[PDB]
Amino acid sequence: THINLKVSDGSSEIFFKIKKTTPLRRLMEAFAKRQGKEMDSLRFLYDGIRIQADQTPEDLDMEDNDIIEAHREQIGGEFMQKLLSLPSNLVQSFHELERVNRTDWFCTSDPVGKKLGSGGGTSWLLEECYNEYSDGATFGEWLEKEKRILLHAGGQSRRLPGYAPSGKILTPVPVFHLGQNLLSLQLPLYEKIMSLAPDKLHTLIASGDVYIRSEKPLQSIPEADVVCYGLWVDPSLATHHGVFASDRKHPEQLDFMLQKPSLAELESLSKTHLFLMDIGIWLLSDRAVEILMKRSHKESSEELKYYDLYSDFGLALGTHPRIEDEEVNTLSVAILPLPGGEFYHYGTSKELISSTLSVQNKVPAMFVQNAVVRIPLCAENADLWIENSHIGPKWKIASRHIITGVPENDWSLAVPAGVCVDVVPMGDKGFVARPYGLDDVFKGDLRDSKTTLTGIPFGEWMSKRGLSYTDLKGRTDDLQAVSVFPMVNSVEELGLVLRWMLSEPELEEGKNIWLRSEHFSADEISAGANLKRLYAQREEFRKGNWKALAV
């Protein structure tokens, strides 16, 4: 008495006739043989549990026309090196802070001076890695050796001040795994991809501020020189991103690239092309890497040049490139839709909150991590993110807040809706107070009424406190470089000055403190932050949160 069984890899289903008392070893071996691989490289699941190979259908009570799911399995084995472009202050400390070893993890920062872009940055990352792990080989020989995952996270993070000095990707994210952050949440996708990739694509490039997800298995990975992942997009969303346009009859090859097309330009091609949103996951062959790298160097001298991977290099790809490049155009290109692909941005504060809510609600918009909260919390306090902070019982809060870094205190601090509070350790014992607003973009000349601090015009913020531009040493063209935030040496002064910078501008001692305190811009904060004290405080809050009998 026999039974028919489907096995699905994610795309197709294939039927096996087998006797109910025959071990599945034969079936799994045959399915592995069919898909070129071998049974060791596959994971067969039925009902959700991983099954052995010496088990018979009668053992696990399966019936005719049932389906078993065959996922790939590249968990252990040859591990890829991670190359990070990070803020320079975090480079010195990343390995100690996250306790990873330098064999698996290399990082650097853009050199002090001019910026290099996505392409130039990638070239500098590959170069700085080779210069430390070459072991005598040449560059082309070194690149062949390992698969490597490169992450761009070295920008200024103007719109996410709470985690700019730690590069955004080191942000703790809750759950409702062990302890985890954005990077640890995202990296398994990159690792799975890079395992499934051919052994000629040795460099994955990830950039942007978008967390990518998918609950379905990946498709096979072509053997082009450039592979790019994307999501099928209607123009209503294509217009906001980089777009791969492909011919109607050729949904695999890349026709050309677009950087944020207009709604009309897309309607002008709606009959002749399909559109994929670039999600910032690329794979390059060694030849692609060499060509990108030489395009990231000058003509005569071979050193450094701003080169944009997506607007310079990228726009030169496809069968109908828009910008000319002799060598770049010769590279083949594959555009892969991400099966079950999902994307959630985290470049801005509002996005941190809403994206973590959306991601959590897949495997209520209030999030408390590594914190002591001494006030009650109800559904009126919606859109909340408290992390590495002590919220004393005399605080008054509302909704839409990001509170990060706040040391232990009994402050009577009121926090208006939409206002956020960040504290950043500085020096051996100081604290920089960085209040701001949920929609501050931290860009703009100070004399423009659209340039805001804590959601009100900067000039107004200055005049409510009796301050003039005479009290600001330095530039005023760009709020991100304006030294407004004071460094103080006590939690008392810290609370006094924070109150003064929010709802109590009449607090005289607050203004006195600010006037006698060193002033930091956001750039100087993320350039000088004492990350070790920030992590130490976070861990002390964790340890306190593990005291089971404490209320």
Author numbering: -78 to 97, 104 to 290, 305 to 492
Any passages from the paper?
The bifunctional l-fucokinase/GDP-β-l-fucose pyrophosphorylase (FKP) from Bacteroides fragilis catalyzes the conversion from l-fucose to GDP-β-l-fucose. The full-length FKP (FKP-FL, 949 amino acids) exists as a tetramer in solution, but the individually prepared N-terminal domain (FKP-NTD corresponding to the sequence 1–496, also containing a SUMO tag) and C-terminal domain (FKP-CTD, the sequence 519–949) form a monomer and a dimer, respectively. FKP-NTD has a single α/β domain and a β-helix-containing domain, whereas FKP-CTD folds into two α/β domains and the linker comprises three α-helices.
To determine the FKP-NTD structure, we successfully crystallized the fusion protein of SUMO-FKP-NTD as well as its Se–Met derivative and used single-wavelength anomalous diffraction method for phasing. The native structure was refined to a resolution of 2.35 Å. One SUMO-FKP-NTD monomer constitutes the asymmetric unit of this crystal. The long N-terminal arm of SUMO, the regions of 98 to 103 and 291 to 304 in FKP-NTD, and the four C-terminal residues were not included in the refined model. The part of FKP-NTD folds into two domains. The first domain (N1; 1–290) contains a seven-strand mixed-type β-sheet flanked by a four-strand antiparallel β-sheet on one side and a two-strand β-ribbon on the other side, plus 10 α-helices. The second domain (N2; 305–492) contains a three-turn left-handed β-helix, which is terminated by a two-strand β-ribbon and followed by a cap subdomain of a flanking β-strand and five α-helices. On the N-terminal side of the β-helix, some features of the electron density map suggested the presence of a bound ligand, which was modeled as a Hepes. The Hepes on the N-terminal side of the β-helix in the SUMO-FKP-NTD crystal was loosely bound. Except for the sulfonate part, it had few interactions with the protein, suggesting a possibility of nonspecific binding.
